[PDB]
């Protein structure tokens, strides 16, 4: 908007000189008179104005970060992103030079960790044009609404060698690969809380006779996929364990349908020895909290009437409940606003034991649930509300004696 | 539309010295007099305004999606389209470096489908100058009519191998 203010001052004389000739006839009378006046004048004035154009209202500076959470660098980062208020968008942009990362390698940012976020400045090629809002987006800014930017594609190179010992960089377009690397792959995603993996692993196609892609399991893609350790049965990332038990899967409906679908003609029933196939969309998160009555343990609390003296558990040992467990969860450990799904591990060899969960969160409810003679998992999910709210109370009544192992508290999407 | 607000403000002070010299005969008599004036003024004033020019009275920007329902995919997405309003077409975009889908597989779109649509903003090369419409096509805007959308053609390339293993979609035009 364009600000003025205008300051004036004026001075001024004026001179009048003014003849008059009067007669009355009633007896006559003659009348003459002269004037004489001047007049002396100062003043001041302000003046303040404003103008606005209702097109290009006002301008806008995204700060913006890159991120590779792939298994190779990118060079010459170039993503193309959508800026969009209240369900329009306001603009499309693909970096230029100003914005283009040289280098992004795996499990890294541009700019890198200690440095400020970049500016998505301009829009145009030359990075010379700012970018506009008009009057009525402006105005929606100033209210609650706020834009959200999305990156619709990313541009960029790898590397080869050349005949001499160069790395060249330059023709070598990674947009040339995208299509056919996810036409050929499944994907796989390991969520760990804090930072998010994400692969693509090859698998045959259905029908095709020809297709000599070698066939292995989900576990096996796994293990490949983020380079895990396996100690025995125990698969192990970096130092969190990424075994089926261990983890929370989610697929999405297809993918759901197809384990479902092939896991009844197989033999000790387990997702990771499912075969991957193309088109899976196989997501793995950590859960916040997990204990498995053994070595491993990060609960806030502990939990009450644990009996560790057992063989009889899912991997080494379980938590005989005959009785009540019980466990605190302050609001401050546990993040507001957010989705979480309460899981673990059942088994009644008597089958007739029955369990009362109770989950104290922000709606108190509680539900009822009969253990099967071999370990089952079980899914119960909650919300919460605000940072400084009332703690999340879990107990676990059961009518006689139950093995319980693997329990985990894992946070899903928002609300 | 520009559109302006001024306000004003203004003090003054005026002295009056007047000497005026009477004589009436009918007897004789004679008048003398003096006067002195001072006035004191304040006002204030407002103004607002608004100014459009009616070649390019407003700017268009058409939020779209990119689809593929054939058997290949389509590298640097290039459409070009026509904005049509009443039976008049006010713009033939190519789309230019911000508009470009890099990657069109068969039975996808671009921008993906969770995400928004794109902004066809600009109109020339360098996507700095924005689509205009005159005066008489913003009074038809507010009113029922409606700007349809046409693609007249769309520019793309092709993959292929070249003599090493990499593959290459840079002069490979589909046209």
Same mark, same amino acid.
């Given at each position: 908007e364009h600000a003025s203010s205008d300051q004036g001052k004026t001075v001024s004389r004026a001179t009048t000189n003014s003849k008059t000739d009067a007669n009355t006839v009633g007896s006559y009378s003659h009348t003459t008179d002269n004037s004489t006046a001047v007049q002396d004048s100062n003043g001041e004035s302000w003046n303040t104005g404003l103008s606005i154009n209702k097109g290009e209202s006002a301008y806008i500076n995204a700060n913006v970060r890159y991120y590779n959470t792939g298994t190779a660098p990118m060079y010459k980062v170039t993503p193309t992103t959508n800026l969009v208020l209240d369900g329009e968008t306001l603009a499309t942009i693909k970096a230029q030079d100003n914005q283009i990362g040289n280098n992004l390698s795996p499990n890294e940012t541009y700019p890198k960790k200690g440095l400020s976020p970049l500016a998505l400045n301009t829009m145009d090629q030359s990075n010379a044009r700012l970018i506009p809002i008009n009057y009525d987006q402006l105005k929606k800014l100033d209210s609650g609404k706020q834009i959200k930017l999305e990156t619709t594609q990313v541009s960029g190179n790898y590397g080869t060698k050349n005949s001499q010992g160069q790395i060249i960089?330059?023709?070598?377009?990674?947009s040339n690969y995208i299509s056919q690397i996810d036409s050929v792959s499944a994907s796989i995603i390991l969520d760990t809380g804090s930072q998010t993996f994400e692969r693509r692993v090859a698998a045959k196609e259905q029908?095709?006779?020809?297709?000599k892609t070698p066939e292995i399991t989900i576990g096996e893609a796994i293990k490949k996929a983020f380079s895990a350790t396996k100690n025995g049965e125990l698969l192990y990332f970096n130092g969190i364990p990424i075994d089926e038990s261990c983890v929370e899967l989610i697929f999405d409906d297809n993918t759901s349908e197809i384990i479902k679908e092939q !896991? +009844? $003609? !197989?033999?000790?029933?387990?997702? $990771?020895n499912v075969k991957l196939e193309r088109g899976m969309n196989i997501l793995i998160k950590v859960p916040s909290y997990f204990t498995?009555?053994?070595? $491993?343990n990060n609960f806030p609390a502990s939990w009450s009437?644990?009996?560790? +003296?057992? /063989?009889?558990? !899912? /991997?080494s040992v379980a938590n005989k409940l005959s009785g009540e467990t019980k466990i605190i969860i302050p609001m401050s450990k546990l993040k507001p606003y957010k989705r979480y799904v309460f899981s673990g591990y059942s088994k009644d060899p008597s089958t007739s034991n029955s369990i009362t969960v109770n989950i104290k969160s922000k709606e108190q409810k509680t539900d009822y649930l009969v253990p099967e003679k071999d370990y089952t998992k079980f899914s119960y999910e909650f919300e919460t509300t605000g940072k400084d709210s009332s703690d999340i109370e879990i107990t676990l009544t059961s009518s006689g004696v139950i093995f319980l192992d693997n329990l985990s508290i894992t946070e899903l999407n928002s609300t």
């Amino acid at each position: 908007e364009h600000a003025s203010s205008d300051q004036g001052k004026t001075v001024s004389r004026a001179t009048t000189n003014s003849k008059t000739d009067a007669n009355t006839v009633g007896s006559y009378s003659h009348t003459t008179d002269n004037s004489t006046a001047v007049q002396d004048s100062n003043g001041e004035s302000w003046n303040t104005g404003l103008s606005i154009n209702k097109g290009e209202s006002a301008y806008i500076n995204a700060n913006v970060r890159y991120y590779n959470t792939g298994t190779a660098p990118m060079y010459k980062v170039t993503p193309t992103t959508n800026l969009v208020l209240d369900g329009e968008t306001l603009a499309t942009i693909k970096a230029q030079d100003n914005q283009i990362g040289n280098n992004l390698s795996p499990n890294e940012t541009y700019p890198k960790k200690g440095l400020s976020p970049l500016a998505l400045n301009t829009m145009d090629q030359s990075n010379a044009r700012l970018i506009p809002i008009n009057y009525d987006q402006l105005k929606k800014l100033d209210s609650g609404k706020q834009i959200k930017l999305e990156t619709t594609q990313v541009s960029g190179n790898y590397g080869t060698k050349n005949s001499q010992g160069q790395i060249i960089t330059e023709g070598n377009s990674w947009s040339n690969y995208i299509s056919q690397i996810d036409s050929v792959s499944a994907s796989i995603i390991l969520d760990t809380g804090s930072q998010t993996f994400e692969r693509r692993v090859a698998a045959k196609e259905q029908g095709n006779p020809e297709d000599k892609t070698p066939e292995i399991t989900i576990g096996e893609a796994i293990k490949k996929a983020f380079s895990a350790t396996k100690n025995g049965e125990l698969l192990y990332f970096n130092g969190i364990p990424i075994d089926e038990s261990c983890v929370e899967l989610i697929f999405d409906d297809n993918t759901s349908e197809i384990i479902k679908e092939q !896991l +009844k $003609y !197989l033999d000790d029933k387990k997702i $990771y020895n499912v075969k991957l196939e193309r088109g899976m969309n196989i997501l793995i998160k950590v859960p916040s909290y997990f204990t498995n009555f053994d070595e $491993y343990n990060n609960f806030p609390a502990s939990w009450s009437n644990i009996d560790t +003296k057992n /063989q009889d558990g !899912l /991997q080494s040992v379980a938590n005989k409940l005959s009785g009540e467990t019980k466990i605190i969860i302050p609001m401050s450990k546990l993040k507001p606003y957010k989705r979480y799904v309460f899981s673990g591990y059942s088994k009644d060899p008597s089958t007739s034991n029955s369990i009362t969960v109770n989950i104290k969160s922000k709606e108190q409810k509680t539900d009822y649930l009969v253990p099967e003679k071999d370990y089952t998992k079980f899914s119960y999910e909650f919300e919460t509300t605000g940072k400084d709210s009332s703690d999340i109370e879990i107990t676990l009544t059961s009518s006689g004696v139950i093995f319980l192992d693997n329990l985990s508290i894992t946070e899903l999407n928002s609300t």
